[PDB]
Design a protein around this nucleic acid. Structure first.
Ligand code: K
Ligand code: K
Ligand code: K
Ligand code: K
Ligand code: MG
Ligand code: MG
Ligand code: MG
Ligand code: MG
Ligand code: MG
Ligand code: MG
Ligand code: MG
Ligand code: MG
Ligand code: MG
Ligand code: MG
Ligand code: MG
Ligand code: MG
Ligand code: MG
Ligand code: MG
Ligand code: MG
Ligand code: MG
Ligand code: MG
Ligand code: MG
Ligand code: MG
Ligand code: MG
Lengths: 139, 263, 152
RNA sequence: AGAAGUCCAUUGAACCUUAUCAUUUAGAGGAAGGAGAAGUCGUAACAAGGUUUCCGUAGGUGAACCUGCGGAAGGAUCAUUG
RNA sequence: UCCGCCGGCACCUUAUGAGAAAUCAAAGUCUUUGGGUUCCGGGGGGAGUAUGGUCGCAAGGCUGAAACUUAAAGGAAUUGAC
RNA sequence: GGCAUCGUUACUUUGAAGAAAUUAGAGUGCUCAAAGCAAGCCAUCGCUCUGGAUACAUUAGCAUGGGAUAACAUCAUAGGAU
RNA sequence: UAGGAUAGGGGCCUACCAUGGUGGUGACGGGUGACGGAGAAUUAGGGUUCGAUUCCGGAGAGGGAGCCUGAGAAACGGCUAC
RNA sequence: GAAACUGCGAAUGGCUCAUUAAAUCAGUUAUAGUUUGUUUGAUGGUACGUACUCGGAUAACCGUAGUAAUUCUAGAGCU
């Protein structure tokens, strides 16, 4: 089984160093690929609303999720961001200024929405929550 | 980096300078002088922080410029002059002859000696060799250098040195059975009697000392300072002279509560 | 003889042409004499250094170099050089997480005087000195041949 | 005493080609995975799945697959002193 | 033919043992955790695939990812249905 | 005060040297607290020498004692000890 | 080995000579979104992650290089060049 | 006592972390391998081949200016 010699510290250390790589989280963090994602290791990002789209919810659900195809200004990547809080697709217009955030599962699709990992947090410098509750008006 | 540094941060000050952490960004850097700038108490930390004579870094100057401070039998004005050990800070006018002695906790204490005992001091002795023209000289441990020393005097000895007429009055050799005060490390300020000296060819001469109250402790060849011949010191110790571990300090506090006040 | 270079090799401050006699003059190296000194630290000067004809300014006993600093014991690794050997210092590094020791080593170049005969695997004791080359900072002070310390 | 200037040596910025290393990206065409509530064609596997199933290897055909040789039971037999 | 010893291939009964269980006299002497040592696994796919390296005449072998996708895949046993 | 000349290490004990700040921690009624290193008292032409403690700080290095457990070569041409 | 230069040791540089030096106890090479430490977060214990930032040490003044003055600078709130 | 000559300081402090993976750095060493304004203590006999104290400049100042221009710059007269 294990090497229990008192003189075998190097063997145990090297074996653990080799075997840490099978870990999903450790390999995710120490491979450096997290910098090639659209956010490039950032909590939020900013973007321009390229277009407004809808995606059919995955089975067995049946609905149309009002997403938005936007383009990040920091690297130019094009991503789809969810728009929650029904009626909040109306606030978003064309080529508009939005603040995007992750969806919650750390680079994983959330819910029945196929392949969406971002949600719109702000539009034109105003939070979607304030507009939804009529606390603020779009400028 | 490219040269010398003229600033001392408060957090980088020596520990025995018990300085309030939120008192400022800087501490008074000790000037160049007889003592090593880490085992010294600058004059700024005497008229302030030890006596309430001065209140700021503006009245220490206001009383040094009046030439009111006479350390080691000489008027000194540099407020960061490094008075480092057993220096006779002799305040004239009021007459506050003080010997800088080491508290049992490594602190610095101004032991108020009598005036006639303030006309001399003692110095530890560094190497003794031949000068130019073959003239032997002393080269003590506080920057002092004395030409034509008595041939019996050797290294690591101690000398009783006069001030007005600077000449060696007498001396004590370094040998077992002599009173010694420790002036470095954790054992600072503890007086005792040397029991034996252990010699290691290459470094680290270790001295073993026996306390008056029965305790025993060791230290380096440095950090020790012979005080008196036999078991009788030549100077008045501040107080206690024993380590007084924490529990017996608690006992002293208890009996101080149970007496005097006692209510 | 010992002169195998394009310059005469001599011990500094040792006058080799005095007309007055010798062999009885203190501080060997006076009135014409090999200069040798004891390095101290409880080390014995070899007879091959006192009654020798070689000239080595980097030799600790008959040279200008003084031994001070660290004393290190080790084993000779490679001695294919001109008055220089490699000493292998084996030790154990404590991997703390696993509370276990791993064997480590470190080569140290040392200067060996012509009074010491050495072989690969000998047990050498060396002492730190001033830098003598790009990598040499130690001088060989004692050599014990491999497979020795016998007698009972 | 001594400036401009000049000679040799040295430190050497900077530019100009070749080669090489590292990073990102265009590309006609090919081709691979995955997802998709629309499908066409069969039924290879799960029951002895209607030819027991599966491994290595080789060939073949619209597709699952078929067949030759050796192996295994994870077999549908723990068994013929008859 | 009978008894005994050492070595081997197995078999039967039973846990007071272990185990998710099938079952195992070793797969036991494990939260009452440590005899020595080698190899090797980290949810299912992509995939033993891409590429580099290397051995081979070739077929191929050894070493061997990533983007992306997914909430299950799987083991043993139980009751029905077939 | 002697006086020698000696297998080497790991391990363990004791000591020393060890920056402060931070952490642990003694005292202290900033109105409490997070804090700060202050303060306290007869009701003074002042005193408590007022206090401004103490630990830990891997590993590596220096020194003292221990020799159980371990690693090296040393082990019968006597080239041994006296 | 002998000089030169330096405040000074040293292939630091020069002439001559020898063929050495490091490496599975990982040299050499590559990555770092790498200044190092005191320290920070979370902590049954062990641990895992972080450490640009006020204390210590190092390095830089757009990028390289050269230098004067001076006890101390290859200084840029000094000069010279690209 | 303005200005100016002379001396000293501006190599500390402040800011940042780009380069840098036994390299910086930490603990521990050595300089018998060196330099050190400064502070403190001590120590300075040979010049001889006017010493009751030697010499020439120069700034501030004053007045002739140049240039679009700058703590850019050239002449003259004092000390
Ligand atoms: K040098
Ligand atoms: K200067
Ligand atoms: K200066
Ligand atoms: K260090
Ligand atoms: Mg020494
Ligand atoms: Mg059939
Ligand atoms: Mg079928
Ligand atoms: Mg079938
Ligand atoms: Mg997996
Ligand atoms: Mg040389
Ligand atoms: Mg050469
Ligand atoms: Mg960096
Ligand atoms: Mg840092
Ligand atoms: Mg900042
Ligand atoms: Mg700093
Ligand atoms: Mg610099
Ligand atoms: Mg800039
Ligand atoms: Mg510069
Ligand atoms: Mg600036
Ligand atoms: Mg600067
Ligand atoms: Mg000036
Ligand atoms: Mg600075
Ligand atoms: Mg690298
Ligand atoms: Mg190193």
């Amino acid at each position: 089984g294990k090497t229990r010699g008192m003189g075998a510290g190097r063997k145990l250390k090297t074996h653990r160093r080799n075997q840490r790589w099978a870990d999903k989280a450790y390999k995710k963090s120490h491979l450096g690929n997290e910098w090639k994602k659209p956010f490039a290791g950032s909590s939020h990002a900013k973007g321009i609303v390229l277009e407004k789209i809808g995606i059919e919810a995955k089975q067995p659900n049946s609905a149309i999720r009002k997403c938005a195809r936007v383009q990040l200004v920091k690297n130019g990547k094009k991503i789809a961001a969810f728009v929650p809080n029904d009626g909040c697709l109306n606030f978003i217009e064309e080529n508009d200024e939005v603040l995007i955030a992750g969806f919650g599962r750390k680079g994983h699709a959330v819910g029945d929405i196929p392949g969406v990992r971002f949600k719109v947090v702000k539009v034109s410098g105003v939070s979607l929550l304030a507009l939804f509750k009529e606390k603020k008006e779009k400028p | 980096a490219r040269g010398l540094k003229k600033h001392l941060k408060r957090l980088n000050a020596p520990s025995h300078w018990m300085l309030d952490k939120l008192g400022g960004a800087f501490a008074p850097k000790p000037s160049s002088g007889p003592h090593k700038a880490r085992e010294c108490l600058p004059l700024i930390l005497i008229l302030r922080n030890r006596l309430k004579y001065a209140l700021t870094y503006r009245e220490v100057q206001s009383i040094l410029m009046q030439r009111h401070i006479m350390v080691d039998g000489k008027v000194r004005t540099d407020k960061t002059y490094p008075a480092g050990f057993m220096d006779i800070i002799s305040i004239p006018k009021t007459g506050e002859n003080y010997r800088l002695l080491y508290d049992t906790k490594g602190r610095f204490r101004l032991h108020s000696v009598r005036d006639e005992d303030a006309k001399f001091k003692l110095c530890k002795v560094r190497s003794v060799q031949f000068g130019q023209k073959g003239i032997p000289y002393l080269n003590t441990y506080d920057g002092r250098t004395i030409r034509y020393p008595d041939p019996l005097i050797k290294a690591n000895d101690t000398i009783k040195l006069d001030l007005e007429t600077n000449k060696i009055v007498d001396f004590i050799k370094f040998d077992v059975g002599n009173v010694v005060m420790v002036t470095g490390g954790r054992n600072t300020g503890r007086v005792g009697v040397i029991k034996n000296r252990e010699k290691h060819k290459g470094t680290f001469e270790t001295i073993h000392v026996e306390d008056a109250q029965g305790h025993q402790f060791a230290t380096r060849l440095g950090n020790v300072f012979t005080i008196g011949k036999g078991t009788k010191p030549w100077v008045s110790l501040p107080k206690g002279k024993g380590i007084k571990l924490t529990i017996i300090e608690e006992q002293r506090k208890r009996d101080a509560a149970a007496q005097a006040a006692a209510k | 003889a010992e002169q195998t270079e394009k310059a005469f090799l001599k011990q500094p401050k040792v006058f080799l042409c005095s007309k007055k006699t010798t062999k009885g003059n203190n501080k060997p190296g006076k009135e014409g004499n090999r200069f040798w000194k004891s390095v101290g630290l409880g080390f014995k000067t070899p007879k091959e250094a006192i009654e020798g004809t070689y000239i080595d300014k980097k030799c600790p006993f008959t040279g200008t170099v003084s031994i001070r600093g660290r004393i290190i014991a080790g084993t000779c690794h490679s001695a294919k050089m001109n008055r220089t050997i490699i000493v292998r210092r084996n030790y154990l590094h404590y991997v703390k997480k696993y509370q276990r020791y791993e064997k480590r080593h470190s080569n140290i170049p040392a200067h060996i005087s012509p009074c010491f005969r050495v072989r690969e695997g000998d047990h050498v004791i060396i002492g730190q000195c001033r830098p003598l080359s790009k990598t040499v900072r130690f001088n060989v002070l004692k050599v014990v041949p491999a497979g020795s310390k016998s007698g009972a």
